[PDB]
Amino acid sequence: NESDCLEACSFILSSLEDPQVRKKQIETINFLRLPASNILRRTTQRVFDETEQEYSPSNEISISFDVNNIDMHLIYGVEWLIEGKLYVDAVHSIIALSRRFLLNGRVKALEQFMERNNIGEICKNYELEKIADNISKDENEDQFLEEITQYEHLIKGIREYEEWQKSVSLLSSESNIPTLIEKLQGFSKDTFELIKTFLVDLTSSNFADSADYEILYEIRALYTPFLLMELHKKLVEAAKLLKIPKFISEALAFTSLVANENDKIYLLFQSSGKLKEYLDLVARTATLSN
Amino acid sequence: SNGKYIPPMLNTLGQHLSVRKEFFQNFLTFVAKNFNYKISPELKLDLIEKFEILNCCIKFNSIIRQSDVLNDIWEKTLSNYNLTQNEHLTTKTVVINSPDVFPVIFKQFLNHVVFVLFPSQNQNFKLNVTNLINLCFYDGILEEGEKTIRYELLELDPMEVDTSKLPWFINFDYLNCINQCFFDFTFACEEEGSLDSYKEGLLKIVKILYYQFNQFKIWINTQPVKSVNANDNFININNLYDDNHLDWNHVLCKVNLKEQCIQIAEFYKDLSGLVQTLQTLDQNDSTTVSLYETFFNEFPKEFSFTLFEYLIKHKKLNDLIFRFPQQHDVLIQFFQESAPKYGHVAWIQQILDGSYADAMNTLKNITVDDSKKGESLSECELHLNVAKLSSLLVEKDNLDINTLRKIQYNLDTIDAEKNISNKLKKGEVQICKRFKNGSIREVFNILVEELKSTTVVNLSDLVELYSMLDDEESLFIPLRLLSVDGNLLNFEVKKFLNALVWRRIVLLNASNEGDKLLQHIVKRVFDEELPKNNDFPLPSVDLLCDKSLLTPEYISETYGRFPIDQNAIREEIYEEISQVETLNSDNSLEIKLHSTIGSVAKEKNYTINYETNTVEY
């Protein structure tokens, strides 16, 4: 009875706690890496079922950046397989995780996933396993590295600025505030360039799956532009800390400049309306207060 | 040491003292033997007091007096440390004299030791702190009184009929001083970085607290129903509870002072400190984890709920989830079963299952950020940004207090008018239940047409009017106006207006069997640091009712130009003056007030003014 094993096993493994006890018991319950797959799968399933209700509702690309505790439990489902030495099943199973993360818009879930496990090794080991099992497969060889991963440079940028601010405040404890502004000005500029530098491409490969270039475009079309918009409000934000003469015209000019759009959103408006809807919503605001 | 046959102190200081002590003891043995329950627990208790004092003073002295070298070393080390705190006081043989008090001798000593404890590294000194604490505070009262005197023969605890709460010597001041000490001493054991040594110190305080609360309920006997129609000490050092208990237990866990967690929790009645110790584990050792699993079925709410508090609050969520499969079902029960000390930890779990909480920023970005204003106002953004920058002259949170007031006075009027206006439009009207009646309710209805319109009216008028209206924002309008813009008026005129906001609160308070309402609003003031900003009188019990700040200005500002019936107002004022006095002179009611006021004042390093009211210029 396949069901009855799966359950008794999953519960045994979970009810034995300590990472080393887990490690060896999972490691040595395997052979052939084709029906050993099944024993671990129910252990995978309980791990997911618990956190299932706590899991984020996004199953589509939207706002959802950064790993929380809920994610980590899901990552652990895959960890059970790795410990078992189940490279046959694992090469398939890596690609499937990466796709769910891509589809629900979790670039950070993938990124972190990418540090702890990497696809490229998995495909090379696969080939060697089917020399001892002799099951047919097509050439699956991978050399994939990260290159999705321009988000780490964003975070790097912020941190230097922030370090000035702690140190800047320390310097500020009765000294000379203008000299501290010169330095702060230096920091914002250099950080701003720094975020725009660094490119990770390296060896050119994908996830051991094609037709995923489309998926990556959409995720970028969200978070990327959101952040861009945030930054475009950020200048205004910073320009309200230390008193300084003039320097207002630059901001005015930028504001004016943000009027020459270039993709045709008005054509979209023409296509189906809401431009209209926006007048209706304005009118309701005006009848409440003008 | 006066008498025909009582010498003015023979011999060794300790020898005559022992002679005297024999005399005090003998008197007690005689009250125990013959007169024990025929004598009230007042006068007799004063004989016990003699021992407590003596024990503490001599112990401190004697350690140093071991060898001659140690005493000479002591005088140098102690003098030097005094210099760092900019003070002086060397001891030997100017200690011992044993003044007749109960905890007060301990109080004095403790402060002095803690003072020159932060520069100190001396070990004779360290040693000396522990002996003073234990002999007087723990040992004097409980282990040289309750255990070895009352519970054998002599009897009459402080929970048997006393003055009207406790014996004559025990008063409000003592209870309030204890509350302070708890937190100052917890700070101090982190500071020396040898938290472990000062467990004992900590143990005494928690013990003394628990005992005391029991004394209060047993003196009137039964369960709370006369402390819920008149707050006293039985909640006055469960203020600092939640946050601090959980923090201090957590700090102690990993540095394996597991015992230290257990005591704090045990006296204030929570399974969380014991349970969190066991759980400190990653998950290591299969046998132990299994044992915890057993306890889920055996105690499905009690053990289960307590356990969650560690894991949610301290975010050891890995344990919560896989490790414990059967606790997901109980984790829902926890949300469906909250109020004692399980609401506070439960909200965090809920918003973090959803993984977003960014909703607050969107609503904020419209109203604080100068980006989306009016519906046909332009130039708003420009003014508002320039204004924020100017009040930025002073460092951090504190703004330049003079610049702030000129904007603030007219703003708080526009905002006040507007708050009721939204309300009036809905066809809703705001009044209190005992202010429903009379001249003010009628005047209010005429005024309803007026409040739609916007026009600058005086802060004195606004202060008086608003405090009698329902709703939190409305009640805030009097406190706001005064803190900031009250210091545009004279000091005496500022305080008198203040008494008046307070007075209305007392009326309401006095009318209900809610006794906690006044406490919360007094507490709130120091948390928003209103006395640090713009000058606002600090909560006092000699600030609630003012009547020595007779200014004709006050007369012409409040009642001379605001249109309310003179007869009515006068009558309310007489009533107001009576109610403040009753809380201020009824014993239980002073305990709740005094206690609460003084601790918060100390922690914040405030001083009650009756001039400037400046706690941060």
**B300 half-sphere exposure, CB direction, 13 A CA radius:** 8
Q: Dihedral through CA B524, CA B525, CA B526, CA B530, nearest 10?
A: 140
Cα separation, B264 vs B280, in Å, equals 17
User: CB-based contacts of A206: which residues, under 8 Å, 6+ apart?
Assistant: A144, A212
| A219: nearest Cα among A103, A52, A138, A69 | A103
Q: Does A51 touch chain B (CB under 8 A)?
A: yes
Interface of B with A in 8-67 (CB under 8 A): none
User: CB-based contacts of A218: which residues, under 8 Å, 6+ apart?
Assistant: A61
Q: Does B364 touch chain A (CB under 8 A)?
A: no
Cα separation, B498 vs B542, in Å, equals 11
Tokens linked to A38: 């099944």
**B389:A286 CB<8 A:** no
Report the residue from A73, A236, A286 with minimal CB separation from B322. A73
CA dist A125 → A80, A114, A137, A140, A284 (Å): 17, 17, 13, 10, 64
Q: What is the DSSP letter of B11?
A: S
Phi-psi region of A63 (alpha: psi -120 to 50; beta: other; left: phi over 0): beta
First-to-last alpha carbon distance for chain B, in angstroms, is 53
- For residue A31, the tally of other CB atoms under 10 A from its CB is 9
Partners of A50 on chain B (C-beta within 8 Å) are 321-322, 325, 328
Triad B146, B151, B153: Cα angle to 5°: 110
| B480: nearest Cα among B456, B507, B493, B498 | B498
**B321:A51 CB<8 A:** yes
Best of A10, A12, A17, A54 to disrupt the B interface by mutation (most B CBs within 10 Å)?
A: A17
Cα separation, B41 vs B215, in Å, equals 13
Interface of A with B in 143-172 (CB under 8 A): 172
Tokens linked to B197: 């040594």
SS (H, E, C) chain A: CHHHHHHHHHHHHHCCCCHHHHHHHHHCCCCCCCCCHHHHHHHHHHHHHHCCCCCCCCCCCCCCCCCCHHHHHHHHHHHHHHHHCCHHHHHHHHHHHHHHHHHCCCHHHHHHHHHHCCHHHHHHHHHHHCCCCCCCCCCCCCCCCCCCCCHHHHHHHHHHHHHHHHHHHHHHCCCCHHHHHHHHHHHHHHHHHHHHCCCCCCCCCCCCCCCCHHHHHHHHHHHHHHHHHHHHHHHHHHCCCCCCCCCCHHHHHHHHHCCCCCCCHHHHHHHCCCHHHHHHHHHHHHHHCC
Note whether A189 and A123 are within 8 A (CB): no
**B392:A241 CB<8 A:** yes
Buried b (16+ CB within 10 A) or exposed e, A186-219: ebbeebeeebeeeeeeeeeebbbeeeeeeeeeeb
Note whether B260 and B196 are within 8 A (CB): yes
**B376:A290 CB<8 A:** yes
Cα separation, B611 vs B593, in Å, equals 22
Report the residue from B355, B388, B392 with minimal CB separation from A70. B355
| B439: nearest Cα among B334, B569, B562, B600 | B569
For residue B356, the SS3 value is coil
Triad B18, B21, B27: Cα angle to 5°: 145
Note whether A83 and A24 are within 8 A (CB): no
Cα separation, B182 vs B544, in Å, equals 28
| B569: nearest Cα among B493, B480, B496, B464 | B464
User: CB-based contacts of B258: which residues, under 8 Å, 6+ apart?
Assistant: B252, B277, B280
Note whether B430 and B420 are within 8 A (CB): yes
First-to-last alpha carbon distance for chain A, in angstroms, is 73
| B213: nearest Cα among B602, B591, B603, B510 | B591
For residue B17, the SS3 value is helix
**A201 half-sphere exposure, CB direction, 13 A CA radius:** 4
- For residue B118, the tally of other CB atoms under 10 A from its CB is 12
Note whether B482 and B459 are within 8 A (CB): yes
For residue B310, the SS3 value is helix
Q: Does B389 touch chain A (CB under 8 A)?
A: yes
Tokens linked to A184: 């702060």
| A128: nearest Cα among A85, A98, A96 | A85
**A50:B293 CB<8 A:** no
Note whether B486 and B494 are within 8 A (CB): yes
Partners of B315 on chain A (C-beta within 8 Å) are 69
Q: What is the DSSP letter of B467?
A: T
Give the largest CA-CA distance in chain A: 81
Partners of B385 on chain A (C-beta within 8 Å) are 240
Partners of A72 on chain B (C-beta within 8 Å) are 318
**B376:A64 CB<8 A:** no
Residue by residue, DSSP assigns B551-603 as -HHHHHHHTSSS-S-HHHHHHHHHHHHHHHHHHHHSHHHHHHHHHHHHHHHHH
Tokens linked to B600: 């918060």
Tokens linked to B419: 């708050």
Note whether B511 and B553 are within 8 A (CB): no
**A19:B328 CB<8 A:** no
